[PDB]
Tab-separated table of C-alpha atoms in Angstrom:
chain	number	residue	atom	x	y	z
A	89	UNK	CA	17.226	-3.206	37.777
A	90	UNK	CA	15.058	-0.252	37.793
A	91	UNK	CA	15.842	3.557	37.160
A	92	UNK	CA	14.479	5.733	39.928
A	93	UNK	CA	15.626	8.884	38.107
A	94	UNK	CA	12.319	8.768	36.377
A	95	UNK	CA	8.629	10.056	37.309
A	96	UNK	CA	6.606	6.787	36.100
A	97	UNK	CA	9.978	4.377	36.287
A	98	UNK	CA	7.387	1.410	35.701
A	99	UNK	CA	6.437	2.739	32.210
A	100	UNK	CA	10.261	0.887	31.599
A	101	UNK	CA	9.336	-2.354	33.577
A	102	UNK	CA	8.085	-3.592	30.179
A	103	UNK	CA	11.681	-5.510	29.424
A	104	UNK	CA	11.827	-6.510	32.779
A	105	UNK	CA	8.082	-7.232	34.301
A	106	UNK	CA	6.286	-8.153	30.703
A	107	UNK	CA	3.410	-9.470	32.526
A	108	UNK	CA	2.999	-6.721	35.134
A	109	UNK	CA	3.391	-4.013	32.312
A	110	UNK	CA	0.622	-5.528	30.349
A	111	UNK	CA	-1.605	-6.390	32.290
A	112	UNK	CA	-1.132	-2.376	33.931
A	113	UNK	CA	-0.907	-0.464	30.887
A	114	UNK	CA	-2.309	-2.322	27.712
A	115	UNK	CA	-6.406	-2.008	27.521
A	116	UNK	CA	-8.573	-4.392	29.073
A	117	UNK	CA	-10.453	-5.148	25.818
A	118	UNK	CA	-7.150	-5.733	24.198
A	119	UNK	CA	-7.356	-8.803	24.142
A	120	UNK	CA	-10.782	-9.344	23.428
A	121	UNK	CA	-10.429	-7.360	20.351
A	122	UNK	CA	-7.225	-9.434	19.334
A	123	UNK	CA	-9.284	-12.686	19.776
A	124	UNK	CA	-12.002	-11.813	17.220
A	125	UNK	CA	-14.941	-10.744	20.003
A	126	UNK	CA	-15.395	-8.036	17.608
A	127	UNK	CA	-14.141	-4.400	19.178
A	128	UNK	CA	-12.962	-3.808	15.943
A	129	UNK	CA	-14.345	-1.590	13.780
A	130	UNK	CA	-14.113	-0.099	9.971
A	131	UNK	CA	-15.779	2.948	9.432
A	132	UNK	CA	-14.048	3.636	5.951
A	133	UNK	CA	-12.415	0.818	3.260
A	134	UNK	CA	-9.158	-0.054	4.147
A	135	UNK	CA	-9.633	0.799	7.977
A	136	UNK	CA	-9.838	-0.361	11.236
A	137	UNK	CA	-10.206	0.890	14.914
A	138	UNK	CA	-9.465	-1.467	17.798
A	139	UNK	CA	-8.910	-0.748	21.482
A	140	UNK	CA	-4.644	-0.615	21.824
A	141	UNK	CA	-3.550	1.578	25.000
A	142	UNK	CA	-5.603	2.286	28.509
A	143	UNK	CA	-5.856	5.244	30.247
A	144	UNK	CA	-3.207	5.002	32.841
A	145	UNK	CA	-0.742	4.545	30.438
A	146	UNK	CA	-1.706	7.434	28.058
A	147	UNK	CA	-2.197	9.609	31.108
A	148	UNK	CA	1.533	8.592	32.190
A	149	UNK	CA	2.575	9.423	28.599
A	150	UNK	CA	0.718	12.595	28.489
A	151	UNK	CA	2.823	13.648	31.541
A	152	UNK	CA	6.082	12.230	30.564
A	153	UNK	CA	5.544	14.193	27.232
A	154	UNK	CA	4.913	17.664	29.468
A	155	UNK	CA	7.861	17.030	31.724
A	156	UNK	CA	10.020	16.862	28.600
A	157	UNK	CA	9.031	20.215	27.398
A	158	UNK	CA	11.024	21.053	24.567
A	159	UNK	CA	8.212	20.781	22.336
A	160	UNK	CA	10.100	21.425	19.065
A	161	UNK	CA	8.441	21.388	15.606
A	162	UNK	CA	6.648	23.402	13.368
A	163	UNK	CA	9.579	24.641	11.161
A	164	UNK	CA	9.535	23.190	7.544
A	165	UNK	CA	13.444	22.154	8.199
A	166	UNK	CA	14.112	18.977	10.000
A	167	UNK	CA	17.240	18.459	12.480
A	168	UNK	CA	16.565	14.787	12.885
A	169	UNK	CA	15.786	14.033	8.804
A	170	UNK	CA	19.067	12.782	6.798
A	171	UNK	CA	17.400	14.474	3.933
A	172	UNK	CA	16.968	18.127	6.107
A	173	UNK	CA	13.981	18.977	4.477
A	174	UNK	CA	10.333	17.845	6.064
A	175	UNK	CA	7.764	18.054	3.914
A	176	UNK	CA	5.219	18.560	6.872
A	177	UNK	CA	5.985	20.616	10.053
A	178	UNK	CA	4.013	20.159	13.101
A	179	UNK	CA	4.872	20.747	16.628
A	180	UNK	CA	5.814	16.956	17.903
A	181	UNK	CA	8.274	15.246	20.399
A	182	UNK	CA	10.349	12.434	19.060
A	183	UNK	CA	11.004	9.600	20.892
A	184	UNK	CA	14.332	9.525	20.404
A	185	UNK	CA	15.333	12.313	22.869
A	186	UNK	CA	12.178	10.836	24.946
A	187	UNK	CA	14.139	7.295	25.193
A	188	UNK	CA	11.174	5.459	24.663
A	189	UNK	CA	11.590	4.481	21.126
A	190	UNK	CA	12.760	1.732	21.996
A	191	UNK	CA	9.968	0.690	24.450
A	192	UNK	CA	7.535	1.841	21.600
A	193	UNK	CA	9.494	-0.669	19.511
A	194	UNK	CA	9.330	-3.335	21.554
A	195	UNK	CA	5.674	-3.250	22.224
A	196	UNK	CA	4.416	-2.951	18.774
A	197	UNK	CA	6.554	-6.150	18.199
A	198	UNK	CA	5.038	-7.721	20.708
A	199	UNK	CA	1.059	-6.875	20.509
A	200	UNK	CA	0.480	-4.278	17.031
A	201	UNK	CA	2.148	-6.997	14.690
A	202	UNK	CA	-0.145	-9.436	15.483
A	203	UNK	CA	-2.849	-7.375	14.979
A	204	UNK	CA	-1.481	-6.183	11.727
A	205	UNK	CA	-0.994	-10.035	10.923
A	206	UNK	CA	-4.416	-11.162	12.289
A	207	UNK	CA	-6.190	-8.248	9.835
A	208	UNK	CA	-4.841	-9.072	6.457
A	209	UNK	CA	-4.226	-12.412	5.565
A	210	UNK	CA	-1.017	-13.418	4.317
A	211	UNK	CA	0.615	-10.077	5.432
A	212	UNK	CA	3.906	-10.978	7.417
A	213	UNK	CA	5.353	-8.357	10.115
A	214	UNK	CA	8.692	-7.585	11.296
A	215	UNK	CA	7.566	-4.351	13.021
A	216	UNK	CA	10.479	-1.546	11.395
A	217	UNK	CA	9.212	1.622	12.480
A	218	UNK	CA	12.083	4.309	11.972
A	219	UNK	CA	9.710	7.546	12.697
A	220	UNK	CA	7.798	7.351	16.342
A	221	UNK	CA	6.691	11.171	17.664
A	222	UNK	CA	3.754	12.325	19.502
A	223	UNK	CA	2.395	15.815	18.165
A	224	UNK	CA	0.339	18.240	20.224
A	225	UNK	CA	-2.141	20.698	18.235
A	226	UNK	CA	-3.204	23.939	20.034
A	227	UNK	CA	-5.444	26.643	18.123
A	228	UNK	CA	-2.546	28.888	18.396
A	229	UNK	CA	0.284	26.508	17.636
A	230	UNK	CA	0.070	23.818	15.402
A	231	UNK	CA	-2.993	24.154	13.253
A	232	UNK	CA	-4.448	21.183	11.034
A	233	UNK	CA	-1.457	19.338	8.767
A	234	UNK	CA	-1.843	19.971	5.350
A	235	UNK	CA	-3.833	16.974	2.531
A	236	UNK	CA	-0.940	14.781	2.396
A	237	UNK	CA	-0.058	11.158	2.636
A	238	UNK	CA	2.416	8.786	5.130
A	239	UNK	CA	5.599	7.526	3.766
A	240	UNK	CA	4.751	4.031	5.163
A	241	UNK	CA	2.949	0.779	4.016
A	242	UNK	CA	0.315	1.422	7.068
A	243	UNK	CA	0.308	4.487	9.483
A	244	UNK	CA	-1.129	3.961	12.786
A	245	UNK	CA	-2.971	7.369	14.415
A	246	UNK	CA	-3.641	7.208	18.641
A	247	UNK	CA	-5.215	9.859	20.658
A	248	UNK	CA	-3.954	10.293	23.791
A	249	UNK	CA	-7.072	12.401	25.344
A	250	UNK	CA	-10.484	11.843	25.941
A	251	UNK	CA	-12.515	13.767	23.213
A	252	UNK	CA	-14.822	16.700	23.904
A	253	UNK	CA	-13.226	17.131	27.188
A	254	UNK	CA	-9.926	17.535	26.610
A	255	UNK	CA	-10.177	19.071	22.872
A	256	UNK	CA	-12.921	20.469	20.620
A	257	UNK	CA	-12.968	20.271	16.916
A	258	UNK	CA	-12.552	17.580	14.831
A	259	UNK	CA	-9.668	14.681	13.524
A	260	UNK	CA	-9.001	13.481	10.042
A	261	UNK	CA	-10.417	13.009	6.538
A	262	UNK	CA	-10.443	10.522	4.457
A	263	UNK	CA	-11.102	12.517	0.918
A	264	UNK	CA	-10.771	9.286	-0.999
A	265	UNK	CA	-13.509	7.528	1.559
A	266	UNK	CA	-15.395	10.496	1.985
A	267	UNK	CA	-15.026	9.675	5.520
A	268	UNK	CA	-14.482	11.834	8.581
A	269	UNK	CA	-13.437	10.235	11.663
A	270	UNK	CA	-15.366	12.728	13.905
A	271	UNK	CA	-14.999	10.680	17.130
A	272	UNK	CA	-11.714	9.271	18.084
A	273	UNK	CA	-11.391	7.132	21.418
A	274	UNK	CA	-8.843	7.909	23.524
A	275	UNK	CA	-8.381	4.011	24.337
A	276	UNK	CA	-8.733	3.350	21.120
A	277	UNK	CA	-6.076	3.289	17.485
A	278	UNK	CA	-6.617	3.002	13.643
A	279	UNK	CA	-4.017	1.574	11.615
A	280	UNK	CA	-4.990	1.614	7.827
A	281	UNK	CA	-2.706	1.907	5.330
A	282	UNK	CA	-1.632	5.687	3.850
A	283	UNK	CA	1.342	4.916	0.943
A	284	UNK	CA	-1.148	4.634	-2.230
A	285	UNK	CA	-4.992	4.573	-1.653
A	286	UNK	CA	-5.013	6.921	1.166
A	287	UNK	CA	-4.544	11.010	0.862
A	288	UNK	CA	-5.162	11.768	4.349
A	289	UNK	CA	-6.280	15.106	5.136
A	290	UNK	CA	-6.381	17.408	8.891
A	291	UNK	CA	-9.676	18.336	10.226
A	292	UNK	CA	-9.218	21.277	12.218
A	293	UNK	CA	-9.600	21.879	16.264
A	294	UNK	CA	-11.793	25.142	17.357
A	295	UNK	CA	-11.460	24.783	21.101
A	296	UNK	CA	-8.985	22.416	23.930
A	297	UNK	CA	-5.384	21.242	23.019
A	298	UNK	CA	-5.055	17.683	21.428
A	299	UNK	CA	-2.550	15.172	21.550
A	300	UNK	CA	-1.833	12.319	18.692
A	301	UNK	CA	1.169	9.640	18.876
A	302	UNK	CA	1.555	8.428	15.573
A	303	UNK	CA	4.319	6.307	13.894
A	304	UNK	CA	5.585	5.508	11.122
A	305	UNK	CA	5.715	1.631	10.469
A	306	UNK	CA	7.113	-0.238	7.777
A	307	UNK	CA	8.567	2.693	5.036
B	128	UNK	CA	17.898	2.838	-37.333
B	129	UNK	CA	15.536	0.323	-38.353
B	130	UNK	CA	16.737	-3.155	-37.005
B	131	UNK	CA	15.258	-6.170	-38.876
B	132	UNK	CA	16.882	-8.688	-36.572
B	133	UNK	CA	13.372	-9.526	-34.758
B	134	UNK	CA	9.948	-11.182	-36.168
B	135	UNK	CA	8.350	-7.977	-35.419
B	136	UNK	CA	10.745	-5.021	-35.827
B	137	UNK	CA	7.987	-2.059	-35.067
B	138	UNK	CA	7.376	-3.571	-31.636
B	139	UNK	CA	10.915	-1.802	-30.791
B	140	UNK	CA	10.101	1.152	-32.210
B	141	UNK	CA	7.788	2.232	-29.403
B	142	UNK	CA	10.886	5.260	-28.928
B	143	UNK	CA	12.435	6.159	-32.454
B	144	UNK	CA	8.250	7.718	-34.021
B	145	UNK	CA	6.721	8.360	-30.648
B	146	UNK	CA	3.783	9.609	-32.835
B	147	UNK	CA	3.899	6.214	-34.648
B	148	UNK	CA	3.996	4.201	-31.882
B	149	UNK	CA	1.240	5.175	-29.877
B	150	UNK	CA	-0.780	5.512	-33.380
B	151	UNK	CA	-0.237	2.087	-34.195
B	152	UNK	CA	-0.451	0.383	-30.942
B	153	UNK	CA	-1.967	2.118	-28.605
B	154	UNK	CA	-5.533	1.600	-27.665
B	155	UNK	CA	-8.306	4.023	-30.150
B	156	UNK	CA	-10.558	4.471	-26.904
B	157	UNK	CA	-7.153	5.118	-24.536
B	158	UNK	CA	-7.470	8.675	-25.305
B	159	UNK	CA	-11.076	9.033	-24.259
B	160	UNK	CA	-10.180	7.081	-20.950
B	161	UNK	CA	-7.173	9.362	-20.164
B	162	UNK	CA	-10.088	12.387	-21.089
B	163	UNK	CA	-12.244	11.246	-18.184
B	164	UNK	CA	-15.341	10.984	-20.026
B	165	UNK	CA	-15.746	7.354	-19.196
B	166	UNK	CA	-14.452	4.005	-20.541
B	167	UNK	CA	-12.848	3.357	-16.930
B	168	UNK	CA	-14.824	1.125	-15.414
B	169	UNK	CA	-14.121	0.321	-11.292
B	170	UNK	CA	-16.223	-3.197	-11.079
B	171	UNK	CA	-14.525	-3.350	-7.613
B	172	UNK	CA	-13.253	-0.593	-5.257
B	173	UNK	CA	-10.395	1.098	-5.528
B	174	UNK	CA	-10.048	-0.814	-9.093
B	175	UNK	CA	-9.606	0.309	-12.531
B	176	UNK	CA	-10.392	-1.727	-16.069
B	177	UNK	CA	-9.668	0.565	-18.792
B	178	UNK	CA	-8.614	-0.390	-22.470
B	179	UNK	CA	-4.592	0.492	-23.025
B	180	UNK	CA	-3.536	-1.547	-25.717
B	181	UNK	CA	-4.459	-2.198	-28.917
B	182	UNK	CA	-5.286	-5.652	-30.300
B	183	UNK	CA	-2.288	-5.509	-32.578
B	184	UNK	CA	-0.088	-5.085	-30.153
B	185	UNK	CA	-1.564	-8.061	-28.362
B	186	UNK	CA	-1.388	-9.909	-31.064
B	187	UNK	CA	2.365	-8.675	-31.662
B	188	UNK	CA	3.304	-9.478	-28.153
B	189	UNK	CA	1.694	-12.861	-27.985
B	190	UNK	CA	3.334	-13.557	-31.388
B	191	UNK	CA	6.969	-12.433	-29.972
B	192	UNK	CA	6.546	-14.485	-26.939
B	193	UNK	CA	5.799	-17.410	-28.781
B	194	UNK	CA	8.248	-16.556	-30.583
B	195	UNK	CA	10.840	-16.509	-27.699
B	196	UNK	CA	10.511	-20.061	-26.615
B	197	UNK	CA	11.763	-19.599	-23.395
B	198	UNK	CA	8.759	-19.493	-20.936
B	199	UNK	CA	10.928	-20.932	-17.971
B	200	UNK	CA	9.327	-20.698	-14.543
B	201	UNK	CA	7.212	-23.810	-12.385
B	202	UNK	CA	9.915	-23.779	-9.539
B	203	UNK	CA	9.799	-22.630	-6.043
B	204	UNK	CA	13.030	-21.593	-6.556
B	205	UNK	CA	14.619	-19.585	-9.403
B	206	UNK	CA	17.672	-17.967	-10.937
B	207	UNK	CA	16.614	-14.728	-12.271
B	208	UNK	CA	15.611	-13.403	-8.807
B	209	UNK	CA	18.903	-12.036	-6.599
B	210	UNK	CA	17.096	-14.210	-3.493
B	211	UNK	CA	16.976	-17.130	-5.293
B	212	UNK	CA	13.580	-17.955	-3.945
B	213	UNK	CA	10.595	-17.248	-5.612
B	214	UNK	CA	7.149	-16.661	-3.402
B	215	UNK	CA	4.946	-17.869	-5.769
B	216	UNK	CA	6.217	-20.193	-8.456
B	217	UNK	CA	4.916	-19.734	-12.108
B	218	UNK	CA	5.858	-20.368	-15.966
B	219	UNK	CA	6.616	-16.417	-17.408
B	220	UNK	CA	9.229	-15.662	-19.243
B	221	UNK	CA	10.869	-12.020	-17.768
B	222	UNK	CA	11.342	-8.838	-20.321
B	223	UNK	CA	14.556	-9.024	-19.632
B	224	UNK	CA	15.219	-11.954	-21.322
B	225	UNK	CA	13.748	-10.929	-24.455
B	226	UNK	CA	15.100	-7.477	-24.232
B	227	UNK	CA	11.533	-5.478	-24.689
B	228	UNK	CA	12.155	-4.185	-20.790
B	229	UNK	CA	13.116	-0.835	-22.094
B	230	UNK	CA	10.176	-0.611	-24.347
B	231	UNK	CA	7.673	-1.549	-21.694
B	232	UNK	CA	9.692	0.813	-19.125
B	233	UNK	CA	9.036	3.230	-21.939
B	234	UNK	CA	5.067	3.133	-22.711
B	235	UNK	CA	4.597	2.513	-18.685
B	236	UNK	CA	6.664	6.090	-18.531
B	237	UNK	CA	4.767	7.940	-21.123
B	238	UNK	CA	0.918	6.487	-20.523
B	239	UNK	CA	0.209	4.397	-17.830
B	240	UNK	CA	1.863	7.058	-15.299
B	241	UNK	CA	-0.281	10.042	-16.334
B	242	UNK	CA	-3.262	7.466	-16.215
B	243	UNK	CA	-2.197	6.811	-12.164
B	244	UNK	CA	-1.800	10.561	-11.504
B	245	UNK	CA	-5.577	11.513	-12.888
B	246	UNK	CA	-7.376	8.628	-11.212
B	247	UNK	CA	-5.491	8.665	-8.033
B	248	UNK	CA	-5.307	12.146	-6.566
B	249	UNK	CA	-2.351	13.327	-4.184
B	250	UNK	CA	-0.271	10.722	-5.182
B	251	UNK	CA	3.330	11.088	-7.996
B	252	UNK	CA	4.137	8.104	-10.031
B	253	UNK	CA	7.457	8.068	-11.386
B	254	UNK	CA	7.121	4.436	-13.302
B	255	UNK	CA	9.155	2.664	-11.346
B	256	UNK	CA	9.008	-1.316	-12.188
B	257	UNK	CA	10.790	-4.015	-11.822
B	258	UNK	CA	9.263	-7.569	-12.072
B	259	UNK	CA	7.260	-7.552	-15.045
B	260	UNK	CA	6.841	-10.998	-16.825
B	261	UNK	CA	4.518	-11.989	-19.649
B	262	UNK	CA	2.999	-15.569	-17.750
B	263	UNK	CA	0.900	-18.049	-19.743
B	264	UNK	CA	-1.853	-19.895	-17.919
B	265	UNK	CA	-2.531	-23.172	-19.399
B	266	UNK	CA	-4.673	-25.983	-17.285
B	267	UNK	CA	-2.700	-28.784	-18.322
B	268	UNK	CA	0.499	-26.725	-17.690
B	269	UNK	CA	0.116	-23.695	-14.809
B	270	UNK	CA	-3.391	-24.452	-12.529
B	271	UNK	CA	-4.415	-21.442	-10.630
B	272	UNK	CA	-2.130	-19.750	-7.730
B	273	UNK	CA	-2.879	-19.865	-3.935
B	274	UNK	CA	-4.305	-16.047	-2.472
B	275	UNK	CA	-1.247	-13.719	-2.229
B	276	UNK	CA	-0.412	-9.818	-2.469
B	277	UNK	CA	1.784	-8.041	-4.277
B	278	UNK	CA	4.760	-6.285	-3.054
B	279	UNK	CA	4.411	-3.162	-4.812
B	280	UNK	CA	2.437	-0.537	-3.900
B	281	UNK	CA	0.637	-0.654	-7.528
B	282	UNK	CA	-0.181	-3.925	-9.303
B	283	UNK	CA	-1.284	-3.885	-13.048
B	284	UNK	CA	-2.882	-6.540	-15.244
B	285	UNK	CA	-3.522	-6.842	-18.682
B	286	UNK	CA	-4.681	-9.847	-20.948
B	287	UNK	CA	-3.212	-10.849	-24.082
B	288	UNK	CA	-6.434	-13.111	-25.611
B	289	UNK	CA	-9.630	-13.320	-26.424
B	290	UNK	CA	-11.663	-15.196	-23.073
B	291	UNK	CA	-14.082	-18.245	-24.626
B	292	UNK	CA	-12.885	-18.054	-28.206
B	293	UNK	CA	-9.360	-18.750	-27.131
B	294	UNK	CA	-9.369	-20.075	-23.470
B	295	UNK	CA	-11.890	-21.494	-20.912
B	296	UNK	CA	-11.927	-19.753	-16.902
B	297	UNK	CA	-11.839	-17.351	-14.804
B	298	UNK	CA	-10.108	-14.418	-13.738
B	299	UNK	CA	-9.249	-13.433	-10.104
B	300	UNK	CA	-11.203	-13.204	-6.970
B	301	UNK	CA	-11.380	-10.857	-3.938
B	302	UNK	CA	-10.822	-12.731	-0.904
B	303	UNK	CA	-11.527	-9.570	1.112
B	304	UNK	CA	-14.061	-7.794	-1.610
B	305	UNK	CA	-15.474	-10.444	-2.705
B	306	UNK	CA	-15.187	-9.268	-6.229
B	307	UNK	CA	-14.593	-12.036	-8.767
B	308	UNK	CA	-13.128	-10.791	-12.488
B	309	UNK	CA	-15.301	-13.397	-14.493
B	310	UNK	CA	-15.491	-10.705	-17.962
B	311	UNK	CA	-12.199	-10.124	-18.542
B	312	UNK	CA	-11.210	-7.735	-21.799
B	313	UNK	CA	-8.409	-7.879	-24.200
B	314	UNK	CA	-7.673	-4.501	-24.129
B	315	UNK	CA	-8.708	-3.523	-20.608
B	316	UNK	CA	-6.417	-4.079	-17.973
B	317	UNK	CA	-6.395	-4.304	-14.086
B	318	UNK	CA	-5.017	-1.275	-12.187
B	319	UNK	CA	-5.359	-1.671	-8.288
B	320	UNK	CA	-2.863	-1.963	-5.509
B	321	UNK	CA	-1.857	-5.316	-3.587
B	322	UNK	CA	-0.113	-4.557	-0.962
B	323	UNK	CA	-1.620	-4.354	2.065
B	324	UNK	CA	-5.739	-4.162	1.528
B	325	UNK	CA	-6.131	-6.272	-1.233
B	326	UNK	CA	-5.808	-10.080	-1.207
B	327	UNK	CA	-6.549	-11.598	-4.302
B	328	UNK	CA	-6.624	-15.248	-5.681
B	329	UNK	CA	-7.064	-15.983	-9.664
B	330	UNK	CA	-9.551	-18.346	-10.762
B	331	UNK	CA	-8.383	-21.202	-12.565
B	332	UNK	CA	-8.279	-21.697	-16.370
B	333	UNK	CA	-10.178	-24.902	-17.929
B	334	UNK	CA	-9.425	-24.914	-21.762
B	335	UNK	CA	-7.385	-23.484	-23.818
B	336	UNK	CA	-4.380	-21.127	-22.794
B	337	UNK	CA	-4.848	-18.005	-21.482
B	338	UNK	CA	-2.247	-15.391	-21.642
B	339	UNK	CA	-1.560	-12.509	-19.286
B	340	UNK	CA	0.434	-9.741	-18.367
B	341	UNK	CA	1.939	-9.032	-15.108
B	342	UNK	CA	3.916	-5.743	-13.989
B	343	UNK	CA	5.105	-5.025	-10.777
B	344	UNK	CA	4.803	-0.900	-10.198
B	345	UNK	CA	6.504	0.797	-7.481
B	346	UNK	CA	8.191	-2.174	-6.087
């Protein structure tokens, strides 16, 4: 099986090559980091930052995301929200029209839980994500999200561009920390928690267009 | 109203004087704390120790639950919860059982909730408990408990004796912190979350029996 009606139809191949899938699109320090070779790091309480997706595969989702063009978002309504109100707009894809929720799914279950697992002792994961959506901020778009908090138990932020030069400005911050995460990797993911000890705040982008993918895990 | 059918008939009148109530059981130095001009002490991060009660209503409490008689709990598996399986097995009696749930529901609604909005900005409480159990740690009886979390996104802790003069321990310690309660107070009680960052294993108790309070907020 394998759906030619698709510009990067081994992006797919997960379900049906696991082995050729990872080893293509996961990071080579991937599993290094997952062993305990270090990689990880912590630069505020409660955080982490480990090496989770490579460059071929962000590049392929980075294209996949342009081809889909409908980049909706940025009204304070939300079509795909039972409730119908979002508390924050921002100019994002969902997955859902994308079709690769389910992918997303599947590979969290397979390599983020144990990494959740592996960081906090006696934490058991069943990987329920029901929000997955990769927003794009432009100076003229989408400007920085406003000090609020992720309706999760831990909410995992990925680039998907190489910093400097791809985008100019800046990426979160962590009031409670007084932390800024002023270099993001674009191999590279933090997952730290956001429901009670985190108010996460948007640092703001002068120059470039950047990308985040950023779902919502366990709510 | 003034029912007489209990050993200590103000401890249910937390709701008919509010004025009364909080005049006559609350903690003197509460008020300060609430203020912000100290008192709140954070021996660990993103911890709180604060005084909230007063020693009479320890004292009442204690009395009531001795009172009660039925301190059930020791199994791995119980009645009272709807799973029938409890994680961690231990000898408390619920509120529920001796019917003080609403009053507890009540003072956690009225001060502990404004306390969680000051010190935590960004976040709304809306006092939202449901396991809550008054547990009594005795070394002959209940030895420590194994590391675990919570699952709530706010745990809070509050002892009912005097440390040394009555009972002969420790407190809890921070797997991941490394922070170790060894100076517990009678009126000051723990206010952190355990969900996710937090690991936490309590010391065990030597002599005596030491008595403690255990609320699960925002479940």
């Amino acid at each position: 099986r394998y759906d030619t009606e698709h510009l990067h139809p081994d992006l797919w191949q997960i379900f049906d090559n696991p082995v050729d899938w990872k080893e293509q699109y996961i990071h080579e320090n991937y599993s290094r980091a997952l062993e305990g070779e270090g990689i990880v790091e912590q630069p505020c309480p409660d955080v982490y930052w480990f090496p989770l997706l490579s460059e071929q595969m962000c590049d392929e989702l980075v294209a996949e995301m342009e081809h889909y063009g409908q980049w909706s978002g940025g009204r304070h309504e939300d079509s795909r929200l039972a409730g119908g109100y979002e508390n924050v707009p921002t100019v994002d894809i969902h997955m859902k029209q994308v079709g690769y929720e389910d992918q997303w799914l599947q590979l969290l279950r397979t390599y983020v839980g144990p990494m959740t697992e592996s960081l906090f002792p006696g934490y058991h994961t069943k990987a329920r994500a029901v929000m997955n959506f990769v927003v794009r901020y432009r100076p003229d778009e989408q400007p920085s999200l406003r000090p609020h908090h992720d309706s999760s138990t831990f909410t995992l932020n990925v680039a998907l561009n190489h910093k400097g030069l791809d985008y100019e400005g800046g990426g979160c911050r962590f009031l409670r920390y007084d932390c800024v995460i002023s270099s993001p990797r674009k191999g590279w993911a933090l997952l730290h928690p956001g429901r009670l000890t985190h108010y996460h705040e948007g640092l703001p982008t002068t120059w470039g267009t950047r990308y985040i993918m950023v779902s919502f895990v366990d709510p």
